[PDB]
Amino acid sequence: VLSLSFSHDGSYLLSGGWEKVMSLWQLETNSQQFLPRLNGIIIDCQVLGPQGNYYSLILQMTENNSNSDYQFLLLNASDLTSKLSINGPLPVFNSTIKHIQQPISAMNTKNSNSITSLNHSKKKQSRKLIKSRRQDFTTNVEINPINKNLYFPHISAVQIFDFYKNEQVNYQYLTSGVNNSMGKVRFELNLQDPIITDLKFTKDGQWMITYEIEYPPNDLLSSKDLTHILKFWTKNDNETNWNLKTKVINPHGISVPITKILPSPRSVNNSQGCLTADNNGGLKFWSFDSHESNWCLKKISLPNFNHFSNSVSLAWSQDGSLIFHGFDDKLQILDFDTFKKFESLENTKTVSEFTLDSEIQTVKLINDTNLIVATRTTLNAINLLRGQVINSFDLYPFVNGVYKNGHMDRLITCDERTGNIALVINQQLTDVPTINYKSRIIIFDSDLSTKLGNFTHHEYISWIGWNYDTDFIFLDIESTLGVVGTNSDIFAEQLHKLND
Amino acid sequence: QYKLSVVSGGKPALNNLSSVTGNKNIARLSQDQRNYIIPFNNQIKVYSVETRQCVKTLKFANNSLLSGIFLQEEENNESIVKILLGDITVPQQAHLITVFTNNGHVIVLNYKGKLVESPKHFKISLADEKLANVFHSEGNYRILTTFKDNSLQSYRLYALTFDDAKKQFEVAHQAEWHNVILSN
Amino acid sequence: TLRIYHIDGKTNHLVTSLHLVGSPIQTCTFYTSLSNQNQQNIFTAGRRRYMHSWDLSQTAKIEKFSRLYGHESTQRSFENFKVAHLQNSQTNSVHGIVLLQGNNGWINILHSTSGLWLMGCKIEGVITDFCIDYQPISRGKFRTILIAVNAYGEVWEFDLNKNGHVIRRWKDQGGVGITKIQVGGGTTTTCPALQISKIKQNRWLAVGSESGFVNLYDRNNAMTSSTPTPVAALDQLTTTISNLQFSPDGQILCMASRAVKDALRLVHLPSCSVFSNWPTSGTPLGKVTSVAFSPSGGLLAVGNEQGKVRLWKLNHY
Amino acid sequence: STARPRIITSKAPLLPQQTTPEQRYWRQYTSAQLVKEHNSVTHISFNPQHPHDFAVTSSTRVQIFSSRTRQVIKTFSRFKDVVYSASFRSDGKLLCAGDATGLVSVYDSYNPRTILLSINASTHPTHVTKFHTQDNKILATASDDRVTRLWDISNAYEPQLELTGATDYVRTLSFIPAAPHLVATGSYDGLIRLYDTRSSGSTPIYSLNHDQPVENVIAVSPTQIVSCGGNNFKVWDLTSNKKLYERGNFNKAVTCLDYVENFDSPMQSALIASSLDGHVKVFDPLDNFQVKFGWKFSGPVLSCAVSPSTAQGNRHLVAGLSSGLLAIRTKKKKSNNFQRMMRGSEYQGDQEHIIHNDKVRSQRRMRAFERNINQFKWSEALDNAFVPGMAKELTLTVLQELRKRGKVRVALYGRDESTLEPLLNWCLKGIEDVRSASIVADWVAVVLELYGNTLESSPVLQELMIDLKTKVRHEIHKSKEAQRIEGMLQLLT
Amino acid sequence: SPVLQSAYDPSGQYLCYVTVALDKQRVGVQPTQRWNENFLYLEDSKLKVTCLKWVNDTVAIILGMNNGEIWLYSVLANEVTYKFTTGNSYEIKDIDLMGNQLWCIDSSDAFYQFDLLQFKLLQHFRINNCVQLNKLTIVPAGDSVAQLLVASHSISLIDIEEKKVVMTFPGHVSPVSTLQVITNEFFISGAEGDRFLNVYDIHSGMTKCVLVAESDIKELSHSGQADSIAVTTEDGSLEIFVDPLVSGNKSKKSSKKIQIVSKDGRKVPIYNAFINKDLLNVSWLQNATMPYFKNLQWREIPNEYTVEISLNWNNKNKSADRDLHGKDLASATNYVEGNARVTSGDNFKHVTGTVTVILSQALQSNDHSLLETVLNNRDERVIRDTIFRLKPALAVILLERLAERIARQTHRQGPLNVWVKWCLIIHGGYLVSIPNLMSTLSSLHSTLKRRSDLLPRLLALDARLDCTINKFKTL
RNA sequence: AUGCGAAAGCAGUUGAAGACAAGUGCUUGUCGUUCGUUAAAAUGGCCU
């Protein structure tokens, strides 16, 4: 029982269980009437009314594991309607933040804790956060290029939130889940939910692309494989619910994670194309047929490599022709029209295959003049006019193991007009690393010769993305969205003033 | 040229540090029940109910006194823990608010208007133990606080009024309980 | 539709024409609160399983009560419901309740501005009708009494300060088919008070039968003799009764049929005498369906089936 | 709060040649009606104006059938020798009939008694007779004398205008939409010719080379014609004087042809070809002339027609076969005091200020298994899933959603043999497939995990397990052979 | 109109208006320039408000009541400050005031002079040759209160210390209703129901001008120094003349005409405008009894003008807790598929007694039945001869049709696998010759991918099955 | 169950003090208690 509450006189009992249902018990005849699903579990509830117009209640959002995100809800008790709903923006992090404690229950899972495990897990997390040199907090955050909303991918859910008004405007599920069909209790709690992991937009904004993985239950024959599903959605320019238009089971053979997804430029098909690359080396170009109604394979290239990189990336020229396919450590440049390596008649040492030092994290092109590559130790800026490196920057002080391979993508972003944005993050030590954090931001030019601007921020920064209207937005660990960018009169007042 | 700013607030600021109280709710309905006050993480928000809309966002940052108190960039140990409606100083005043923090600061602000940068600020003494709760009857107010000398907390209950001189707060020992487990 | 009219003598201009969907309005009623005295509500209901509440200027506020928290098994409908104040006797927080007819002897009682289920009482047989009276005790403390009539004529009187405890029963003299009751002479569902001091005990009690007979009692001695005799027996009409309404001040009893044209009478109290001149053979009523009195202006309002309400000012008041 | 989500049926990904929406509609044409007639049927047409009527020609016997009853309504048999071509008039009141003794007879429909006008054209057999489309008082007859005549229906004594220059056996002709002066004639040696009437008219304006003998021609749009000749058929562009497509999608010679435009169906304009081999195929000219549907009749089909675009009755598709066969396929289509007392409900609220609805959007039903799932009684959920006359897709989506949500063990603990058996039978079938076979493999695995003691105790299941031993071994041999044929195709790359 | 009477205060910020409610009159005051509840009821039930006028430190009004009384009503505290009493019981036909001297005209044809500062009755009074009196006013000669006007249907100008007519003018047919001084020599008069405002010049006694309305005249107001005249006309209109005292020019038509019409097109009436220089204040009745206002600039107004408002006519009730339809905002759009096409990930698209003549015929065409029979043959040797006989493009089209029939009817893959084995045996030359193997054999590639990568789950199930099988049938 | 790694897996981990409850000073078991490390149960299921 996570919340108990009494009515004002002493005849009704508000009960606050885990199962997502708030129950009113009329004591006198001993009967119950209850509200069934409330978007999570209810930590708190009570009655505020002068007679009882309003219930106040506080939600946990227990589906999110890494960061306990609470939400305030105020219910008119006549209809039991949601007279007021307040919530801050909801991210999800790779790893759990500084000292949050998942609530108590009856059993243990990866979403809850029993009592002994609760205390021991508090101590365990604090000790591991001091000890382990791996941690990162790298989330994916999107921007609506015609609505300027932020699309936070929750697990099995999406939060559309704008920061001009600082108020949540939509919440949705996008997954064949168990999202509202039943509040989970014990073994249903040990069950895990299908996770959205990749979400991107087409540049026209009228085609949303997403990619969610789904897990099996425990201890069955088919609990060995996972299942990846690709999805294409639309919406109009005025609605605020997304309609699913194409769902694809198991891209790239079976049980193969789609690893990197890419929204095509305007020039190809009015931004109606996407690139999907698996973890072995394949490329696929899907798009939208308009004499069909749908999305299809436009082109493939599937080598059968029996080595696997967890870390891939790819980028696309603005004239729709040069596809920079970055596998681990050995980039390629391909012509789009055949998906094969750029075979030159000139052969002037701007050859299609490149080798760098270590595993490549993120490539971009700032224009068709410079390719910007980030590996696991350094950052390099290379020309396209000539097959030769230009600028080098040492980073193996900072990016040591502090990022799981593939997340500097959601660190580094850039404008398309001036420069690129680099990130450094350091935990503020004492003499032993303490819990607290600190962050440094660099603003580079296209040549990467001079830092166009340096900045410091006193807390851990998770993600910087670029606004299409030429600025930068960023998410902080304490979820504070910040920006980097450019007679008569006296009588009049008295009239407004107005047992035997 | 390039400027950095904090724009949108996040988390709605629970009473997690206590975790022994059974009523974590801090937000409060006003006297006139048209509006609702939410203590956030970096600001305090005013909502008007019948339009479901935010109206005034009292940010901690623009106010120097709050920014000199609430965003202390070595620790945010000080956090809001209680909200009271009217004016603690003198009774029968309108659109006012008293904010009660984790460490002995007591502020009076005034929503519904251009908030003047003159926050009515006072400090309640004996802050070797940190504030646990504040509540009230008519005029006679009570304070719960958290003391220690087995990995638990002792609770002290104190009685409270105002104005010996302006700053001198009449906190007096009422009672003490030794080691709480769960409370409401 | 709900239509709200502002009344002149010379014109009647339409304040608001609210129109709902799918809800046949069987009964609608004003209700002003008591403590705050600035809260106004309009309740309406029909033969559905909800109840619409409109609050009191371009987009209005309307909630729907729908959940009897313990038991939907009694009342599959909301066709008969009235509003009354009730005092709590622990706190002095008088608040508004709605009383609903039910299945067999079930009258249920819902706390209004919450939507809560407070309490339910039940008699046997078949509940035909019910109404409200009050009793002051002290300076601002008062108990409300619920009165219910079975078909046979077993009047029950319950109270509602403590939970449902039968004060008493008695049986009306004669009374084969009882089909409306109403109290009057003080405060009621049509002539309510505006502040707690003016709540006054009702004096006269009316039982309108199936014949057209109306038995008419004095409460001050009826309560005593406990199977009492009528103060009088009206026997005018030839068909059923469906509307009985008292004056604001306790003199005039309006009775009204529902089956033939021009089937209304006025009875002057305490003589229990039928009025003679009005209405004549020259007054347009049709099937009278709905009578209403004024609080203090001295108006009588009468509707009918054709749709045209009509006014009649008493030049005496 | 919120509402409950309805469970979705597990829509497994599509295998090729899905049911296309055109195939939905063109098979909503159903209900084969056969009527045996005398001899082969030459020509069939439908009335334009009130399309409730259609005529069929035959051996010396013209029959009028009607659209309400699908039955013979009227009989024309005042002819001497074989009538070839009967058509209705564009206004509908009149019909023309062309015989082989050398004449046409025209008269208003519904009254065989009144031979209204009898025009003796050339003593050769008049092959086809039609009316104008734009004009309404000029009738055209192509007789086998290699000349087609335009008879003005007022002076029937002489042809108002000849049309000569043809080569051999003009057997079809068509008018044209935009122009009332431009007439197309289909010969029997190709050279689809185009003549003017407001010229002198002895010589044609030009022609087209359908190098096969043309068998029908139709104005499909006021800038386009279609031609039926030989095996293929083709579509020609008027202005460019140059063919735009050929479709060679048939077996024997295409015999009859018809076009129709803008009715109520998921396709815009339909082109029916009937091709002498049972085969009647509908294409569409807006899909660049590709095949969309086709039926088969045994005998060669000599004529076909559709109900016209202003049909408004149950639509017809009429096929005429040389064995004597008309085959039709038809897409079909208190007290006064009381009312005065309670007449209020039918009002809708017009002239009221503020309108509000709130009643629910009354959903589809909830199946009993869905009630079982939402009220958690999981054993009853499974049993109700194995109710006999159910949808296989329903059974799959039951087991899939239960396997995602809860636990197959907690829905399987309360079991005996007598309720083990039907699940096992459904596994016995549904392992043969694929999309079921994965999930049901999981389920058979977990029940074999659980109940081995009852297995060795009971003999009925020992029967089922040995057969299940065959079927999986039977199925694994199938999928083992699948890989060899897949890798074989890699060798061809 | 349900407003019995109304009057603006000078300098135009409030209107006082008196109406009926349950047959007891109530008076109320509302500001205009930017709702209110302090109304005053008259506790008697027979009395009617018979005249209304303003006065300015307590801003207050004066109400002449037909009982025979004149009440001075404080507007700050809703209290009847004073009760001036005629020594009679009739109707006060009219009131007027200046400085602190006040004169009222009584329905029994009587004159009264009072003073406010002394709360006092100066002089009861009469004159002769004035049989009915229903309008009066006083000229603003200064502090000098000489030579006031009375009128019923023929306006008459009278002294005080001489108390007689001096100039009598032929008024109107109807009793006069509107009578005001503009400049110290000129007054405007307009009766009840006539449509003409007569501009009378005093000292010549001459009907200097006439203004025509369009309809019957209800309320009159005028600017500072005759700069403009506003007329509220009974069918609901506001007509203004510019410069009445300027100069076929004996009459003057209406210069500008303003009406109010909301979005609905129903014509809301207008009552009792007020004008100043370059500022026009128009009022109307929104609900049944409450008045709403607008300001507008008459010199920028064109000749015929329709002020718009957004009046509630068929508003759907788009409340706060509601969706576009149905839901409340704290819910979520729950995920439902509906009608999405579902494809797999490997559906490459958009990238000696033989029968060979009859198969090739059906496949040149597209014949389910004949293809069905030629596959319903079963001999392997017949298969060998016929596929050795066939032509390559028809072999390609055979491959696709065959894979289609398998993928729909999985039972047939037992027998039919010999063909797809045998097709690739022979026409491998032309198959190598075409480039696009994948898109030419899309369906076949997909179906084989399906069964082949299904295999290992079947392997595991077979193993556990055989383990159980041996375990129980060995004992 | 942590580290590394691809959805394979590849290595390792499960240890201390305290205090109490029960059975008979002894055994087990428990932990709204501390150290140290890469570490299933009270017939009780979703509104109109």
From Swiss-Prot, chain B:
Extra remark: Present with 6560 molecules/cell in log phase SD medium.
- Physiological role: Involved in nucleolar processing of pre-18S ribosomal RNA. Required for optimal pre-ribosomal RNA transcription by RNA polymerase I together with a subset of U3 proteins required for transcription (t-UTPs).
Query: How is this protein named in the record?
Result: NET1-associated nuclear protein 1
- Covered range within the whole protein? 9 to 200 of 896
Which species? Saccharomyces cerevisiae (strain ATCC 204508 / S288c)
**What does the record give as the organism's lineage?**
Eukaryota, Fungi, Dikarya, Ascomycota, Saccharomycotina
Top-rank lineage group of the source organism? Eukaryota
Subcellular location, record wording: Nucleus, Nucleolus
Cystine bridges: none
The UniProt subunit note reads as follows: Interacts with snoRNA U3. Interacts with MPP10. Component of the ribosomal small subunit (SSU) processome composed of at least 40 protein subunits and snoRNA U3. In the absence of snoRNA3, forms a complex with other t-UTPs. This complex can associate with pre-18S ribosomal RNAs.
Curated annotation (Swiss-Prot), chain C:
Q: Which UniProt keywords apply?
A: Nucleus, Phosphoprotein, Repeat, Ribonucleoprotein, Ribosome biogenesis, rRNA processing, WD repeat
Q: Which superkingdom is the protein from?
A: Eukaryota
- Swiss-Prot/TrEMBL WD repeat ranges: 20-57, 186-227, 236-277, 283-316
* Location (main, coarse): nucleus
Q: Where in the cell is it found?
A: Nucleus, Nucleolus
Q: Which GO terms describe its cellular component?
A: 90S preribosome; nucleolus; nucleoplasm; Pwp2p-containing subcomplex of 90S preribosome; small-subunit processome
User: Keyword Repeat: yes or no?
Assistant: yes
An example GO BP is: endonucleolytic cleavage in ITS1 to separate SSU-rRNA from 5.8S rRNA and LSU-rRNA from tricistronic rRNA transcript (SSU-rRNA, 5.8S rRNA, LSU-rRNA)
Quote additional remarks: Present with 9570 molecules/cell in log phase SD medium.
**Subunit (UniProt):** Interacts with snoRNA U3. Interacts with MPP10, UTP21 and UTP25. Component of the ribosomal small subunit (SSU) processome composed of at least 40 protein subunits and snoRNA U3.
Q: Which family does it belong to?
A: Belongs to the WD repeat UTP18 family.
Name the job this protein performs. Answer: Involved in nucleolar processing of pre-18S ribosomal RNA and ribosome assembly.
Name of protein: U3 small nucleolar RNA-associated protein 18
Query: Lineage of the native species?
Result: Eukaryota, Fungi, Dikarya, Ascomycota, Saccharomycotina
Chain's gene name = UTP18
Q: Which residues of the full protein are shown?
A: 271 to 594 of 594
Curated annotation (Swiss-Prot), chain D:
Predominant location of this chain?
A: nucleus
Q: Which SMART domains match?
A: WD40 (SM00320)
Q: Where in or outside the cell is it found?
A: Nucleus, Nucleolus
Q: Which GO terms describe its biological process?
A: maturation of SSU-rRNA; maturation of SSU-rRNA from tricistronic rRNA transcript (SSU-rRNA, 5.8S rRNA, LSU-rRNA); positive regulation of transcription by RNA polymerase I; rRNA processing
Q: Name one GO cellular component term.
A: nucleolus
What UniProt keywords apply to this chain's record, in alphabetical order?
Nucleus, Repeat, Ribonucleoprotein, Ribosome biogenesis, rRNA processing, Transcription, WD repeat
Q: Whereabouts are the WD repeats?
A: 36-77, 78-117, 123-161, 165-205, 209-246, 249-293
Q: Which InterPro entries match?
A: U3_snoRNA-assocProt_15_C, WD40/YVTN_repeat-like_dom_sf, WD40_repeat_CS, WD40_repeat_dom_sf, WD40_rpt
Domain of life of the organism encoding this protein: Eukaryota
Q: Which GO terms describe its molecular function?
A: U3 snoRNA binding
A Pfam family cross-referenced in the UniProt record is: WD40
Function of this protein? Involved in nucleolar processing of pre-18S ribosomal RNA. Required for optimal pre-ribosomal RNA transcription by RNA polymerase I together with a subset of U3 proteins required for transcription (t-UTPs).
Q: How does it assemble?
A: Interacts with snoRNA U3. Interacts with MPP10. Component of the ribosomal small subunit (SSU) processome composed of at least 40 protein subunits and snoRNA U3. In the absence of snoRNA3, forms a complex with other t-UTPs. This complex can associate with pre-18S ribosomal RNAs.
- What else does the entry mention about this protein? Present with 358 molecules/cell in log phase SD medium.
Q: What is this protein identified as?
A: U3 small nucleolar RNA-associated protein 15
Q: Which gene encodes it?
A: UTP15
Swiss-Prot record, chain E:
Q: Which family does it belong to?
A: Belongs to the UTP5 family.
InterPro entries, per the entry:
SSU_processome_Utp12 (IPR007148), U3_snoRNA-assoc_WDR (IPR052414), WD40/YVTN_repeat-like_dom_sf (IPR015943), WD40_repeat_dom_sf (IPR036322)
Q: Where are the WD repeats?
A: 12-43, 44-83, 171-210, 212-247, 319-351, 389-429
Q: What else is known?
A: Present with 33100 molecules/cell in log phase SD medium.
Q: Where in the cell is it found?
A: Nucleus, Nucleolus
Gene responsible for this protein: UTP5
What is this protein's record name? U3 small nucleolar RNA-associated protein 5
- Is the keyword Transcription in the record? yes
Q: Which GO terms describe its biological process?
A: maturation of SSU-rRNA; maturation of SSU-rRNA from tricistronic rRNA transcript (SSU-rRNA, 5.8S rRNA, LSU-rRNA); positive regulation of transcription by RNA polymerase I
* Assembly: Interacts with snoRNA U3. Interacts with MPP10. Component of the ribosomal small subunit (SSU) processome composed of at least 40 protein subunits and snoRNA U3. In the absence of snoRNA3, forms a complex with other t-UTPs. This complex can associate with pre-18S ribosomal RNAs.
Organism the protein comes from: Saccharomyces cerevisiae (strain ATCC 204508 / S288c) (Baker's yeast)
Q: What functional role does this protein have?
A: Involved in nucleolar processing of pre-18S ribosomal RNA. Required for optimal pre-ribosomal RNA transcription by RNA polymerase I together with a subset of U3 proteins required for transcription (t-UTPs).
Query: Which Pfam family is one of those matched by this entry?
Result: Utp12
Superkingdom of the source?
A: Eukaryota
What GO cellular-component annotations does this UniProt entry give? nucleolus; nucleoplasm; rDNA heterochromatin; small-subunit processome; t-UTP complex
The lineage is: Eukaryota, Fungi, Dikarya, Ascomycota, Saccharomycotina
